Amino acid sequence: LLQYGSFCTQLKRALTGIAVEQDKNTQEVFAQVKQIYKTPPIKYFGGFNF
Amino acid sequence: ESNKKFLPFQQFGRDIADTTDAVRDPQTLEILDITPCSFGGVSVITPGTNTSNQVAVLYQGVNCTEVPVAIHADRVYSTGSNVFQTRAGCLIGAEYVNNSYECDIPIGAGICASYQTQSQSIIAYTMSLGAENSVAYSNNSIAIPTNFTISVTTEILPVSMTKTSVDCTMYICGDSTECSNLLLQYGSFCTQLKRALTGIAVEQDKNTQEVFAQVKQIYKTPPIKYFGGFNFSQILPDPSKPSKRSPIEDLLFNKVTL
Amino acid sequence: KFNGLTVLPPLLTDEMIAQYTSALLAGTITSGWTFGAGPALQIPFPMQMAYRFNGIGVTQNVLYENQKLIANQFNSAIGKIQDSLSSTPSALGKLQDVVNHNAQALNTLVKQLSSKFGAISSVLNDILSRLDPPEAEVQIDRLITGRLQSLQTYVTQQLIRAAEIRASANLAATKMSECVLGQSKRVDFCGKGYHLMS
Amino acid sequence: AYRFNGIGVTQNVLYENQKLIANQFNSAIGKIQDSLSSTPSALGKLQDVVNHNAQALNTLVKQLSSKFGAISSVLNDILSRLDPPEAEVQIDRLITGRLQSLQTYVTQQLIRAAEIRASANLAATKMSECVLGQSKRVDFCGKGYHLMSFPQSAPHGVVFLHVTYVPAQEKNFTTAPAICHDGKAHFPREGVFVSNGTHWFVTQRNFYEPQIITTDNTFVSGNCDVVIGIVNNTVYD
Numbered sequence: 183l184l185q186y187g188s189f190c191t192q193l194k195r196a197l198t199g200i201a202v203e204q205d206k207n208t209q210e211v212f213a214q215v216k217q218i219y220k221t222p223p224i225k226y227f228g229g230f231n232f
Numbered sequence: 233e234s235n236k237k238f239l240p241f242q243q244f245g246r247d248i249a250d251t252t253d254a255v256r257d258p259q260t261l262e263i264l265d266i267t268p269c270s271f272g273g274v275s276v277i278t279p280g281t282n283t284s285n286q287v288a289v290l291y292q293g294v295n296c297t298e299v300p301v302a303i304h305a306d307r308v309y310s311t312g313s314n315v316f317q318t319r320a321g322c323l324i325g326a327e328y329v330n331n332s333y334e335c336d337i338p339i340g341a342g343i344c345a346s347y348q349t350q351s352q353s354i355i356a357y358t359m360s361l362g363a364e365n366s367v368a369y370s371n372n373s374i375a376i377p378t379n380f381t382i383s384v385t386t387e388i389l390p391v392s393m394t395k396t397s398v399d400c401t402m403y404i405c406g407d408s409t410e411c412s413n414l415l416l417q418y419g420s421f422c423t424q425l426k427r428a429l430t431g432i433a434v435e436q437d438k439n440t441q442e443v444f445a446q447v448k449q450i451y452k453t454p455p456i457k458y459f460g461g462f463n464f465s466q467i468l469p470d471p472s473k474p475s476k477r478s479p480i481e482d483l484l485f486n487k488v489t490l
Numbered sequence: 491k492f493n494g495l496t497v498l499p500p501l502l503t504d505e506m507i508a509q510y511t512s513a514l515l516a517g518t519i520t521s522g523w524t525f526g527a528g529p530a531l532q533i534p535f536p537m538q539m540a541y542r543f544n545g546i547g548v549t550q551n552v553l554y555e556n557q558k559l560i561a562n563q564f565n566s567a568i569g570k571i572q573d574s575l576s577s578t579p580s581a582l583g584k585l586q587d588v589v590n591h592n593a594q595a596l597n598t599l600v601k602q603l604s605s606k607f608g609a610i611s612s613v614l615n616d617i618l619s620r621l622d623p624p625e626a627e628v629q630i631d632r633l634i635t636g637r638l639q640s641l642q643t644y645v646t647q648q649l650i651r652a653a654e655i656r657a658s659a660n661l662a663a664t665k666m667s668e669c670v671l672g673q674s675k676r677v678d679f680c681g682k683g684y685h686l687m688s
Numbered sequence: 689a690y691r692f693n694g695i696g697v698t699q700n701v702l703y704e705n706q707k708l709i710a711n712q713f714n715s716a717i718g719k720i721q722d723s724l725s726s727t728p729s730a731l732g733k734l735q736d737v738v739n740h741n742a743q744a745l746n747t748l749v750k751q752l753s754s755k756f757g758a759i760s761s762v763l764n765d766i767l768s769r770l771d772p773p774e775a776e777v778q779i780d781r782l783i784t785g786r787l788q789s790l791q792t793y794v795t796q797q798l799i800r801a802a803e804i805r806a807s808a809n810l811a812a813t814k815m816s817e818c819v820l821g822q823s824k825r826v827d828f829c830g831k832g833y834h835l836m837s838f839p840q841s842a843p844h845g846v847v848f849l850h851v852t853y854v855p856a857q858e859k860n861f862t863t864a865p866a867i868c869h870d871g872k873a874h875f876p877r878e879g880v881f882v883s884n885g886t887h888w889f890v891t892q893r894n895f896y897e898p899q900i901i902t903t904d905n906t907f908v909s910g911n912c913d914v915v916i917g918i919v920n921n922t923v924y925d
């Protein structure tokens with residue numbers, strides 16, 4: 183198989199790029215805020231129920 | 233050992249993927265399960281060579297109470313030192329701490345690594361999402377700003393790429409008539425390749441055309457640059473240099489090197 | 491873990507994503523749209539509801555004089571969602587298709603290993619134990635070639651699917667920015683009707 | 689002043705803080721050159737195009753030295769050593785392998801071109817919406833309330849400079865939904881009722897500027913026995 187060139191490097195590079203892209207998708211969708219806000223202990227919001 | 237209920241006439245065993253996963257011992261009638269031996273990938277975690285020469289090693293998806301010694305295929309050498317077990321595999325050469333910082337080098341399921349001063353060493357930790365904050369909510373309270381800030385940010389976007397063309401005869405057969413005649417029997421692949429490349433080049437030109445040619449006139453700034461105290465000298469063209477480019481554009485063109 | 495094929499874990503676990511979602515919900519409940527453009531500023535919930543009605547062309551006294559009715563309607567509507575999702579079986583086909591396609595592709599790739607490609611046998615050990623060095627090459631070449639095209643086809647299909655997944659993720663990010671962190675005037679972008687909040 | 693009015697702030701806020709705003713803008717525009725120059729990985733997106741093109745071309749030209757199970761990788765060697773009726777067996781393997789190399793290159797190029805076209809379409813939309821106008825879409829033309837943008841060119845790409853407004857230095861206040869007076873309810877026209885502890889004013893939402901409550905900035909439209917949390921005071925005429 184060593185005589186067939188360098189196909190394996192291309193395959194590995196493609197798969198690695200796909201994986202990195204997969205992580206970046208979630209990173210840019212969900213990490214929209216810098217702080218971590220917390221809801222007040224008592225849940226009264228004028229009659230609305232969350 | 234196997235708990236499978238083999239019928240008294242069958243000997244082998246198979247799975248959904250059609251592989252051998254059971255066998256019957258000939259001399260003593262018994263059923264044995266076969267499992268493949270451990271294998272995986274090896275990753276090397278390093279800071280820049282301008283900083284240090286230490287490294288850490290990650291064995292991916294392997295319980296490493298089972299691998300103090302194994303071969304590298306692509307040779308036996310072990311490291312010892314500090315061994316930590318994670319979800320993505322296990323880590324050799326790094327120390328686990330109880331703190332939490334911003335992620336620097338991603339590793340696995342919420343684990344990152346960094347080069348710290350503790351002397352300097354390589355440490356592993358769980359990434360921190362951010363700073364905790366709670367807003368004082370009440371049903372008769374409000375907050376109103378009393379000042380403001382003007383902020384300027386940048387955004388970079390690619391537009392086009394390089395246009396290339398390829399010739400079949402020169403690339404494949406060089407200048408051999410016999411090779412060309414032999415290749416003539418393979419059909420009309422070359423026409424398809426040429427058409428695809430030509431379409432790509434035309435698209436590349438159209439991208440820039442539709443991004444930048446948004447106006448019909450060519451407006452010119454007034455000779456005297458007074459705009460109520462605002463200073464646009466950094467983005468307006470500079471006539472002193474022959475290229476007729478703004479300082480920021482010059483910096484951008486210098487930064488990107490072929 | 492099937493013949494050189496491995497699956498890597500995602501970087502962000504489910505708990506971290508849940509924490510992100512909780513933070514977004516708390517921010518949009520206690521502040522409104524202010525926390526998406528700077529510091530978070532507190533405001534009572536009915537007052538921002540009045541602001542959101544004012545943003546679609548209805549005065550505030552409409553909200554302030556129908557508070558209980560609006561709250562009851564919202565509570566009933568939010569209650570019906572669990573039943574609506576649970577009853578319909580095909581409500582989550584989009585998320586199931588990803589798993590199905592990945593499993594099918596991996597199964598096809600591993601099943602391709604048993605083909606012969608015009609050779610004496612599909613097992614390398616059989617050829618290495620039956621034949622001799624100077625003749626086994628003719629048989630081995632066909633196997634090597636066929637497995638090579640199998641791998642190439644798999645990789646190309648993966649790239650084509652990844653492009654579509656990226657497009658969908660970009661749309662989801664835009665919707666997160668525009669429907670959740672603010673109020674949208676675009677028609678039929680954040681639901682059907684006049685948008686209030688998401 | 690028009691652009692401030694477009695985000696909910698009156699014009700007198702600009703006209704009475706002209707020098708301060710100009711100085712802030714000048715400092716912010718000054719910091720950009722240093723910010724771009726210091727960071728080395730600021731322009732990775734534009735460098736990746738060049739890197740990928742060079743890598744693909746290098747791989748394609750390097751593939752020419754493979755043998756593909758032939759006696760030699762040079763056509764002239766086979767044409768000078770062997771004879772016509774036998775060289776075909778060797779030449780066929782080379783022709784085939786070079787054919788798959790070319791096909792793989794072309795397919796990769798098409799796949800990359802699709803992504804480049806998508807990015808160019810996004811850039812065109814941003815040019816139309818952030819530069820030729822003012823955008824109300826959140827987080828589309830920067831972070832904050834959008835004011836205006838400037839374009840700059842770059843090798844194989846474009847750079848946008850977004851200018852935005854950010855509030856600062858908030859403060860506690862007490863508020864009410866409506867004001868009761870003479871058995872009538874009063875609501876603000878634009879703004880919110882606010883109290884400093886003993887007196888009530890009406891103010892705009894994005895900047896603190898109290899005013900005296902008057903019939904010229906309120907409307908009655910109702911009665912005092914329905915609203916929850918109403919507070920009764922005096923309304924000047």
Ligand SMILES: *[C@@H]1O[C@H](CO)[C@@H](O[C@@H]2O[C@H](CO)[C@@H](O)[C@H](O)[C@H]2NC(C)=O)[C@H](O)[C@H]1NC(C)=O
Pocket residue numbers: 231232
């Ligand atoms: C918000 O809605 C939930 C769900 O309807 C309410 O929880 C219910 O409370 C009643 C009374 O305690 C119970 O009988 C139900 O079994 C609860 N339902 C569930 C699903 O747990 C909750 O009480 C509501 N909030 C308020 C403040 O009333």
Ligand SMILES: *[C@@H]1O[C@H](CO)[C@@H](O[C@@H]2O[C@H](CO)[C@@H](O)[C@H](O)[C@H]2NC(C)=O)[C@H](O)[C@H]1NC(C)=O
Pocket residue numbers: 379380708711712
């Ligand atoms: C709003 O913020 C600006 C920016 O900091 C304040 O202006 C500064 O005021 C201090 C105090 O005199 C000066 O030392 C700085 O030089 C000013 N900055 C600039 C850029 O001129 C301004 O005072 C703040 N507004 C209020 C009401 O305090």
Ligand SMILES: *[C@@H]1O[C@H](CO)[C@@H](O[C@@H]2O[C@H](CO)[C@@H](O)[C@H](O)[C@H]2NC(C)=O)[C@H](O)[C@H]1NC(C)=O
Pocket residue numbers: 463464465
């Ligand atoms: C607009 O900003 C530029 C850049 O700060 C100013 O140019 C500076 O001018 C001073 C005084 O002549 C020189 O000492 C600096 O060396 C200049 N900087 C550069 C980078 O050339 C320019 O003066 C400003 N515009 C106005 C009207 O003052």
Ligand SMILES: *[C@@H]1O[C@H](CO)[C@@H](O)[C@H](O)[C@H]1NC(C)=O
Pocket residue numbers: 295297
């Ligand atoms: C690793 O093997 C040990 C041996 O008993 C076991 O206790 C442990 O749970 C295993 N861990 C993982 C992650 O498989």
Ligand SMILES: *[C@@H]1O[C@H](CO)[C@@H](O)[C@H](O)[C@H]1NC(C)=O
Pocket residue numbers: 329330
């Ligand atoms: C690290 O220390 C913290 C604080 O004592 C503790 O909560 C955490 O469990 C520790 N992590 C370990 C022991 O892995």
Ligand SMILES: *[C@@H]1O[C@H](CO)[C@@H](O)[C@H](O)[C@H]1NC(C)=O
Pocket residue numbers: 224226369370371
């Ligand atoms: C709502 O206002 C009442 C006073 O009318 C107060 O007692 C209660 O604590 C407030 N709610 C919250 C969550 O603070």
Ligand SMILES: *[C@@H]1O[C@H](CO)[C@@H](O)[C@H](O)[C@H]1NC(C)=O
Pocket residue numbers: 368857858859860
């Ligand atoms: C507003 O009130 C809260 C609760 O008392 C307080 O924590 C916060 O600091 C106040 N805001 C300012 C700007 O002081």
Ligand SMILES: *[C@@H]1O[C@H](CO)[C@@H](O)[C@H](O)[C@H]1NC(C)=O
Pocket residue numbers: 884885886887
């Ligand atoms: C509130 O504003 C009024 C305006 O007349 C002023 O007289 C009073 O002193 C202020 N109270 C405080 C606590 O600043």
Ligand SMILES: *[C@@H]1O[C@H](CO)[C@@H](O)[C@H](O)[C@H]1NC(C)=O
Pocket residue numbers: 919920
């Ligand atoms: C004014 O408000 C107070 C506080 O709720 C209330 O007791 C009083 O009755 C109101 N005035 C009139 C005339 O009703």
